[PDB]
Design an enzyme around this catalytic site. Structure first.
Site, PDB file in Angstrom:
ATOM      1  N   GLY A 242       0.699  -1.286   0.001  1.00  0.00           N
ATOM      2  CA  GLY A 242       0.263   0.009  -0.158  1.00  0.00           C
ATOM      3  C   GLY A 242       0.813   1.314   0.105  1.00  0.00           C
ATOM      4  N   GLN A 243       0.160   2.531  -0.047  1.00  0.00           N
ATOM      5  CA  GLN A 243       0.731   3.788  -0.235  1.00  0.00           C
ATOM      6  C   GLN A 243       1.384   3.818   1.166  1.00  0.00           C
ATOM      7  OE1 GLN A 243      -0.924   7.405  -1.748  1.00  0.00           O
ATOM      8  NE2 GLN A 243      -0.887   8.166   0.473  1.00  0.00           N
ATOM      9  N   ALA A 244       1.050   3.609   2.168  1.00  0.00           N
ATOM     10  CA  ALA A 244       1.607   3.815   3.502  1.00  0.00           C
ATOM     11  C   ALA A 244       2.753   2.941   3.918  1.00  0.00           C
ATOM     12  CB  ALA A 244       0.773   3.529   4.688  1.00  0.00           C
TER      13      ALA A 244
ATOM     14  N   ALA B 122      -7.722  -0.415  -4.733  1.00  0.00           N
ATOM     15  CA  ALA B 122      -8.720  -1.151  -4.080  1.00  0.00           C
ATOM     16  C   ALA B 122      -9.728  -0.008  -3.212  1.00  0.00           C
ATOM     17  CB  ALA B 122      -8.113  -1.618  -2.959  1.00  0.00           C
TER      18      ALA B 122
ATOM     19  N   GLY C 233      -6.283   1.954   4.149  1.00  0.00           N
ATOM     20  CA  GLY C 233      -6.772   1.659   2.928  1.00  0.00           C
ATOM     21  C   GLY C 233      -7.201   0.182   2.276  1.00  0.00           C
TER      22      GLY C 233
ATOM     23  N   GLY D  92      -3.599  -1.905   1.618  1.00  0.00           N
ATOM     24  CA  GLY D  92      -2.766  -2.027   2.948  1.00  0.00           C
ATOM     25  C   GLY D  92      -3.604  -2.846   3.960  1.00  0.00           C
TER      26      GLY D  92
ATOM     27  N   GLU E 118      12.841 -13.975  18.380  1.00  0.00           N
ATOM     28  CA  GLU E 118      13.254 -13.670  19.790  1.00  0.00           C
ATOM     29  C   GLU E 118      12.343 -12.101  19.855  1.00  0.00           C
ATOM     30  OE1 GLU E 118      17.712 -13.419  20.292  1.00  0.00           O
ATOM     31  OE2 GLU E 118      16.865 -12.369  22.133  1.00  0.00           O
TER      32      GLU E 118
HETATM   33  N1  LIG Z   1       1.771   8.132   8.685  1.00  0.00           N
HETATM   34  C1  LIG Z   1       1.457   7.558   7.639  1.00  0.00           C
HETATM   35  N2  LIG Z   1       0.197   7.094   7.261  1.00  0.00           N
HETATM   36  C2  LIG Z   1      -0.192   6.949   5.908  1.00  0.00           C
HETATM   37  C3  LIG Z   1       0.683   7.266   4.556  1.00  0.00           C
HETATM   38  N3  LIG Z   1       0.288   6.758   3.644  1.00  0.00           N
HETATM   39  C4  LIG Z   1      -1.076   6.247   3.839  1.00  0.00           C
HETATM   40  N4  LIG Z   1      -1.392   6.219   5.368  1.00  0.00           N
HETATM   41  C5  LIG Z   1      -2.719   5.865   5.937  1.00  0.00           C
HETATM   42  O1  LIG Z   1      -3.276   5.009   5.248  1.00  0.00           O
HETATM   43  C6  LIG Z   1      -4.531   5.503   5.284  1.00  0.00           C
HETATM   44  C7  LIG Z   1      -5.210   5.472   3.740  1.00  0.00           C
HETATM   45  O2  LIG Z   1      -5.319   4.188   3.352  1.00  0.00           O
HETATM   46  P1  LIG Z   1      -3.866   3.418   2.609  1.00  0.00           P
HETATM   47  O3  LIG Z   1      -2.934   2.538   3.567  1.00  0.00           O
HETATM   48  O4  LIG Z   1      -2.808   4.668   2.162  1.00  0.00           O
HETATM   49  O5  LIG Z   1      -4.322   2.908   1.213  1.00  0.00           O
HETATM   50  P2  LIG Z   1      -3.460   2.930  -0.243  1.00  0.00           P
HETATM   51  O6  LIG Z   1      -1.955   2.474   0.209  1.00  0.00           O
HETATM   52  O7  LIG Z   1      -3.569   4.384  -0.804  1.00  0.00           O
HETATM   53  O8  LIG Z   1      -3.993   1.755  -1.267  1.00  0.00           O
HETATM   54  P3  LIG Z   1      -5.665   1.910  -1.501  1.00  0.00           P
HETATM   55  O9  LIG Z   1      -6.309   0.845  -0.810  1.00  0.00           O
HETATM   56  O10 LIG Z   1      -5.822   1.904  -3.066  1.00  0.00           O
HETATM   57  O11 LIG Z   1      -6.309   3.322  -1.154  1.00  0.00           O
HETATM   58  C8  LIG Z   1      -4.571   6.765   5.877  1.00  0.00           C
HETATM   59  O12 LIG Z   1      -5.614   7.127   6.526  1.00  0.00           O
HETATM   60  C9  LIG Z   1      -3.352   6.824   6.415  1.00  0.00           C
HETATM   61  O13 LIG Z   1      -3.473   7.187   7.850  1.00  0.00           O
HETATM   62  C10 LIG Z   1       2.153   7.713   5.061  1.00  0.00           C
HETATM   63  O14 LIG Z   1       2.774   8.026   4.074  1.00  0.00           O
HETATM   64  N5  LIG Z   1       2.251   8.013   6.319  1.00  0.00           N
HETATM   65 MG   LIG Z   2      -3.273   3.908  -2.980  1.00  0.00          MG
END
Ligand SMILES: Nc1nc2c(ncn2[C@@H]2O[C@H](COP(=O)(O)OP(=O)(O)OP(=O)(O)O)[C@@H](O)[C@H]2O)c(=O)[nH]1
Ligand SMILES: [Mg+2]
Ligand SMILES: CC[C@]1(O)C[C@@H]2CN(CCc3c([nH]c4cc(F)ccc34)[C@@](C(=O)OC)(c3cc4c(cc3OC)N(C)[C@H]3[C@@](O)(C(=O)OC)[C@H](OC(C)=O)[C@]5(CC)C=CCN6CC[C@]43[C@@H]65)C2)C1
Ligand SMILES: Nc1nc2c(ncn2[C@@H]2O[C@H](COP(=O)(O)OP(=O)(O)O)[C@@H](O)[C@H]2O)c(=O)[nH]1
Ligand SMILES: [Ca+2]
Lengths: 331, 54, 439, 428
Positions: C10-12, C99, C143, C146, C254
């Site tokens: 995922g993006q995060a 997604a 997301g 993720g 561990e």
């Molecule tokens: N701290 C932090 N949180 C993030 C970041 N990117 C996404 N998030 C978290 O992810 C949430 C959004 O869903 P994502 O996990 O980003 O979904 P995605 O990776 O874009 O993939 P999709 O399901 O297609 O949207 C947000 O509410 C954030 O809290 C990041 O770069 N830093």
């Molecule tokens: Mg995304």
């Protein structure tokens, strides 16, 4: 404008609080389950502490100290005093007590010091020889405590009657400890029964078990101006010197003991709370602590004043609006 | 109070300090799960195309 | 030496991953092109830092990393950004459309169409591993990818690698920076499915990171790059032991053994200090006493909650910089009397301690100042179930009206899987309460 | 590239569509000849959501122009940006639809629809990653109303899994005097209730009041109305046309706004409001942006927000401003009027900030609310419908195209259900 929710509908004390707050034009009441409050007048049971302090834009304040139940439950209060260096057997103001389970308790350690003019106490049950007492707790199933009964109480005259004392202590978010200057003695209508006590009403001074058997006080409530004026004339003293100094030292000691475990100094939400402390003045003018009540009710005469003080000391201090009834116990 | 298992490298040290003693699905079932789902969906879509043809 | 593979989902996960791999490179002196002057084993080796990097004949140290987003925007940044030579193409896996913040669409619909290609690219990494030990999986709860792809990949990894360990770094959803009101749905869903496939999960509430950034870094409106640099430090602290010489937490098993006596209660609370603004005009440096004490302040935790109102099962102090044991125990002595640190009867009151003499590495230009000593505590406290309670409450409010449910059902998921996941979380919250019942 | 296929049908649809196109074209820096002349890489990053490219590095709106009669097409071809549209994308007939929904849906438009669909399917077979479709049209007429919704039913059957999005202009007796408009709107709403994922309710009642009352424009023209309508359309599409996190495609937007499939009717709002030609002298403060854009006087559907509850909400700010203050101001709104947001959708208000301000403003705010108060809109039309239909008045203009009364009873029923459905979740 501030908002607040009400989640304990059987609180005389906080009915008046929300009444006052509303009566100000600067506070709105929300649906109980609306998250966007400033003030939770919370429930009595399983208050959702972990849900507080996570609403951005909102300072949140709640009317209970999480953890404060350790001080306000009879099984716990005993364990708190015994197992805590700041109090311990360092303690002269708490009757001898033990926790007991209706078959890590003290039913055996209890018999130990029992070998010695022994009267004790448990919905309660007092006696002079164990067996029956231990048998009683074995009847019911909830943990029970057995503190020495105070054989020589101080007896009011005219009447030769027993009394207890209720003091309301407010603790704000800064952990200021405030003693409302007005207290009450919950007296007894019928004279104390030296020989033979397994009857009650005249020993147990609880307001309920006395608006059901009762003369000298309306409702059986003696306030301080009269109890002080009595102490002057019969004992040649003041309530202050004789009783209040020991009370303050008992309140201050109790709440500072737990301050590290319940303070909200650097917490994401703040707490205040109203406590009812119950004391027993014995023959020699020595104060004894009975119970601490986590949700006190007031006395009808005094609701007005205590409930505006709560609003001013505890709520307006954190959410301010658009000569004090309390005694700050300075620690 | 008691320092156990002390170990030292040239990058740092490691040790314990104790102050008081005490007192699964398969690639098979996974396919039946996913396929049942894409099943439940292809049917819902076809219910839609059927209504659209009415 | 046993290798560890990171998987950024995922993006995060991907953007957090990127920041970790940048911090990692700084730490081992690896340049933006995989070259590492300080390695004298040209072409390989089995040094401690080879758990996270493998080696190229021409001299390249390349992450044992795989990135996977269901759309190309973010991983493109990695394909083009400053560290593009560090990864080889086969490990940056991107899809067509995403997604749509829908768990069911990441697990069931679009996941299925990519699970195999991802497992493939993963096994390619295992094959060049002498004694692979497990996986580090970086993802958000909120997301679609993720949460829903990540839970699918987990179940496959357990089938495809039983012997192996799997730790998570899981970003918990916070309104201040969330982009979807269904995140509580996706969060319960993916926690329920993944509970039995993850050995140890490090939950980071974006809420906690955000306030640390405002309060201690004086950042008006923290962005993802602020959040992710701080997350890169906490994470680097927890993985320092696998990349450097030491004797504490030397392999993934561990983290299990030290932190997780109960398999389902595998969510240890991380706490980090000091966080100092690099913009501060000189700073009175903090002591071992001061930093170790900081570890019991809610405002330093990766999850706001109150460990006074729960019991402990385990506790690790990870130090970085200038620290000697005498100080640590001196410190532990004082706080032991100032704080409420009750463990569960069936456990000893003790701390495992790790010290790495090399102070925390600062990203040049970042918001963090360079401190002479630092510490991450890893405590398994029951107070972290606060975070489960509030996320479960948000789920209930929406689910009692079936709000948005039709989006997941529309992807082939049955309404009932919602109550199954929530029923698990209700058990999980009871588990937590049993363990910490005393006072 | 997540593309969007734009369809504009009828007079209204083609006139607010042509005005949407010239406004976003500006925002992106395309001249009436399709050539980029912008001063920012931000203008071209997501350009392919609404444009195709060709040799010469020219951009062509991914847009299809449909009417049952030949004017408007002429009007648009000879308008400012008339020359950018692909010529083969003008699909028009000759008869017209005489403000008759049945003529658009069943008879006249039936003849023409497939020629529209071949340009649609042409434009679609040319997309990396089609998000779905966005249609502009009115509900009060015959072509945009009857043929507009026919096309939605066809397109959905060919693309059952893409997103269908419409900007649907609702009729009002303050602006027009055709007695059968309540018929054409109720037949259209029935269709939209069943076959679109998102519908922006652009209400001509609200556009009229804003222009007459608020803007002091005592002889309002459609160009005045359409000035408000293109500010809104620009606004509610910012998140799709520049880089960002919130609501950046149509499915993302739908999952955030639509908690139940039928409640997909949105109240747009905008601030500051402005007359075409209004010289703008001072920017709004971030707090003025906020209180104003939630104000009822700024809504594009004529409904009272304080008469309902907000289910979901999207807010878009544009221009150079402080994230911190936006966030503080969005939070105060929800905290100070918190009973207006259903407590059973936690955190139901999502906010985006785009740096590029719209044409002529240093700062604007666009609001998209899914409020149960929009039942007031459907009740207004239903009351006009019922008064005629209880005497079957004017039905022969429709039964003579082949329609049956029963089809009217069904539209009326499905729209009365939509109202009672909003009322349910407004009590709850
Ligand atoms: N701290 C932090 N949180 C993030 C970041 N990117 C996404 N998030 C978290 O992810 C949430 C959004 O869903 P994502 O996990 O980003 O979904 P995605 O990776 O874009 O993939 P999709 O399901 O297609 O949207 C947000 O509410 C954030 O809290 C990041 O770069 N830093
Ligand atoms: Mg995304
Ligand atoms: C944005 C698109 C528009 O331009 C908006 C409108 C209408 N249009 C054509 C322009 C036009 C107008 N007027 C005309 C009189 C003519 F002979 C020929 C043409 C026009 C309007 C105008 O510019 O007026 C100065 C114009 C028109 C109308 C109006 C206000 C208004 O402007 C403030 N009402 C609010 C309506 C009205 O019913 C009422 O009060 O009750 C609600 C009117 O009744 C009265 C006042 O007594 C009126 C007046 C003829 C009576 C019969 C039929 N109704 C349909 C519209 C309505 C009329 C501009 C489309
Ligand atoms: N806001 C706005 N509304 C319009 C415009 N043109 C027409 N309308 C509305 O559309 C209705 C008439 O629909 P019509 O154009 O005849 O539909 P068509 O026959 O399919 O093209 C009227 O009630 C108007 O309120 C316009 O330019 N702006
Ligand atoms: Ca090597």
């Amino acid at each position: 404008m501030y908002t607040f929710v009400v989640r304990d509908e059987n609180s005389s004390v906080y009915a008046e609080v929300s009444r006052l707050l509303l009566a100000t034009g600067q506070w709105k009441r929300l649906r109980k389950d609306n998250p966007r409050f400033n003030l939770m007048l919370g429930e009595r049971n399983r208050l959702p502490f972990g849900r507080l302090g996570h609403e951005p834009g909102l300072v949140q304040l709640v009317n209970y100290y999480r953890g404060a139940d350790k001080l306000c439950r009879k099984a716990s209060l005993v364990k708190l005093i015994k197992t805590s260096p700041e109090l311990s057997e360092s303690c002269t103001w708490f009757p001898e007590s033990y926790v007991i389970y209706p078959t890590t308790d003290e039913r055996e350690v209890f018999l130990a010091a029992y070998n010695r003019g022994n009267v004790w106490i448990a919905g309660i049950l007092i006696s002079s020889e164990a067996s029956e007492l231990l048998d009683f707790i074995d009847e019911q199933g909830q943990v029970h405590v057995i503190q020495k009964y105070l054989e020589k109480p101080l007896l009011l005259e005219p009447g030769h009657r027993k009394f207890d004392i209720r003091s309301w202590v407010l603790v704000d978010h800064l952990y200021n400890i405030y003693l409302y200057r007005e207290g009450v003695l919950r007296t007894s209508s019928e004279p104390y029964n030296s020989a033979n006590f397994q009857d009650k009403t005249c020993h147990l001074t609880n307001h309920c078990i006395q608006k059901e058997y009762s003369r000298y006080e309306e409702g059986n409530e003696m306030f301080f101006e009269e109890f002080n004026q009595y102490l002057m004339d019969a004992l040649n003293t003041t309530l202050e010197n004789s009783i209040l100094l020991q009370i303050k030292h008992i309140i201050r000691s109790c709440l500072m003991c737990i301050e590290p475990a319940i303070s909200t100094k650097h917490l994401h939400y703040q707490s205040f709370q109203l406590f009812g402390f119950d004391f027993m003045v014995d023959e020699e003018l020595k104060v004894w602590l009975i119970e601490v009540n986590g949700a006190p009710a007031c006395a009808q005469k005094l609701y007005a004043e205590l409930c505006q003080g709560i609003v001013d000391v505890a709520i307006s201090s954190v959410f301010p609006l658009a000569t004090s009834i309390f005694i700050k116990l300075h620690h | 109070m008691e320092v156990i298992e002390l170990n030292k490298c040239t990058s740092g040290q490691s040790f314990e300090v104790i102050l008081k003693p005490p007192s699964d699905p398969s690639l098979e079932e996974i396919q039946k799960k996913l396929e049942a789902a894409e099943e439940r969906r292809k049917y819902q879509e076809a219910e839609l195309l059927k209504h659209l043809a009415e | 030496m046993r290798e560890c593979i990171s998987i950024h989902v995922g993006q995060a996960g991907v953007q957090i991953g990127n920041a970790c791999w940048e911090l990692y490179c700084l730490e081992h002196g690896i340049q933006p092109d995989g070259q590492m002057p300080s390695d004298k084993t040209i072409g390989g080796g089995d040094d401690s830092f080879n758990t996270f990097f493998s080696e190229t004949g021409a001299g390249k140290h390349v992450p044992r990393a795989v990135f996977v987003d269901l759309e190309p925007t973010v991983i493109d940044e990695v394909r083009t950004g400053t560290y593009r030579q560090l990864f080889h193409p086969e490990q940056l896996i991107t899809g067509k459309e995403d997604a749509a913040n829908n768990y069911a669409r990441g697990h069931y619909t679009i996941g299925k169409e990519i699970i195999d290609l991802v497992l493939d690219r993963i096994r390619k990494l295992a094959d060049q591993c002498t004694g692979l030990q497990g996986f580090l999986v970086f993802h958000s709860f909120g997301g679609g990818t993720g949460s829903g792809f990540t839970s699918l990949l987990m179940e496959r990894l357990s089938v495809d690698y039983g012997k192996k360990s799997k730790l998570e770094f899981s970003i918990y959803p916070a309104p201040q920076v969330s982009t979807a009101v269904v995140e509580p749905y996706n969060s319960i869903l993916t926690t329920h499915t993944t509970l039995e496939h993850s050995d140890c999960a490090f939950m980071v509430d974006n809420e906690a990171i955000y306030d640390i950034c405002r309060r201690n870094l004086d950042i008006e409106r923290p962005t993802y790059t602020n959040l992710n640099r701080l997350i890169s430090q906490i994470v680097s602290s927890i993985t320092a032991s696998l990349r450097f010489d030491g004797a504490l937490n030397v392999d993934l098993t561990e983290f299990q053994t030290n932190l997780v006596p109960y398999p389902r209660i595998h969510f240890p609370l991380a706490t980090y200090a000091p966080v100092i603004s690099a913009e501060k005009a000189y700073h009175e440096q903090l002591s071992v006493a001061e930093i170790t004490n900081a570890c019991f302040e809610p405002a330093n935790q990766m999850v706001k909650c109150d460990p006074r109102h729960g019991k402990y099962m385990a506790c690790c102090l990870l130090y970085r910089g200038d620290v000697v044991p005498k100080d640590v125990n001196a410190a532990i002595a004082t706080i032991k009397t100032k704080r409420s640190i009750q463990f569960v009867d069936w456990c000893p009151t003790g701390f495992k301690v790790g010290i790495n003499y090399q102070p925390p590495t600062v990203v040049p230009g970042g918001d963090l100042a360079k401190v002479q000593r630092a510490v991450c505590m890893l405590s398994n406290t029951t107070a972290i179930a606060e975070a489960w309670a509030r996320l479960d409450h948000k789920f209930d409010l929406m689910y009692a009206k079936r709000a948005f449910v039709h989006w997941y059902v529309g992807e082939g998921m049955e309404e009932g899987e919602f109550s199954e996941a929530r029923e698990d979380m209700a058990a999980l919250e009871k588990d937590y309460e049993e363990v910490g019942v005393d006072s | 590239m997540r593309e969007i296929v734009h369809i504009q049908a009828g007079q209204c649809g083609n006139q607010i569509g042509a005005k949407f196109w010239e406004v976003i074209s500006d925002e992106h820096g395309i001249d009436p000849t399709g050539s980029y002349h912008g001063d920012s890489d931000l203008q071209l990053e997501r350009i392919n959501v609404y444009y195709n490219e060709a040799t010469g590095n020219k951009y062509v709106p991914r847009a299809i122009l449909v009417d049952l009669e030949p004017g408007t097409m002429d009007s648009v071809r000879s308008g400012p940006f008339g020359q950018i549209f692909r010529p083969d994308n003008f699909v028009f007939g000759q008869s017209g639809a005489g403000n008759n929904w049945a003529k658009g849906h069943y008879t006249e438009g039936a003849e023409l629809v497939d020629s529209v669909l071949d340009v649609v399917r042409k434009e679609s077979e040319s997309c990396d990653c089609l998000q779905g479709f966005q249609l502009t049209h009115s509900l009060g007429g015959g072509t945009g109303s009857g043929m507009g919704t026919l096309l939605i039913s066809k397109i959905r059957e060919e693309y059952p899994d893409r997103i269908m999005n419409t900007f649907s202009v609702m009729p009002s007796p303050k602006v027009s005097d055709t007695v059968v408009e309540p018929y054409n709107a109720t037949l259209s709403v029935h269709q939209l209730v069943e076959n679109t994922d998102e519908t922006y309710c652009i209400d001509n009642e609200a556009l009229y009041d804003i222009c007459f009352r608020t803007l002091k424009l005592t002889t309002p023209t459609y160009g005045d109305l359409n000035h408000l309508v293109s500010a809104t359309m620009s606004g509610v599409t910012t998140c799709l046309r520049f880089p960002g996190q919130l609501n950046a495609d149509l499915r993302k937007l739908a999952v955030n706004m639509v908690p139940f499939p039928r409640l997909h009717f949105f109240m747009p709002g905008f601030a500051p409001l402005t007359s075409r030609g209004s010289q703008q002298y001072r920017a709004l403060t971030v707090p003025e942006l906020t209180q104003q854009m939630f104000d009822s006087k700024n809504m594009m559907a004529a409904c009272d927000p304080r008469h309902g509850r907000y289910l979901t909400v999207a807010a878009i700010f544009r221009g150079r401003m402080s994230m911190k203050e936006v966030d503080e101001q969005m939070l105060n709104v929800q905290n100070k009027n918190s009973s207006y947001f259903v407590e059973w959708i936690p955190n139901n208000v999502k906010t985006a900030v785009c740096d590029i301000p719209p044409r002529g403003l240093k700062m604007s705010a666009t609001f998209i609310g899914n409020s149960t108060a929009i039942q007031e809109l459907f009740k207004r039309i239903s009351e006009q419908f019922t008064a005629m239909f209880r005497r079957k008045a004017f039905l022969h203009w429709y039964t003579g195209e082949g329609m049956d009364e029963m089809e009217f009873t069904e539209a009326e029923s499905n729209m009365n259900d939509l109202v009672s459905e909003y009322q349910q979740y407004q009590d709850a």
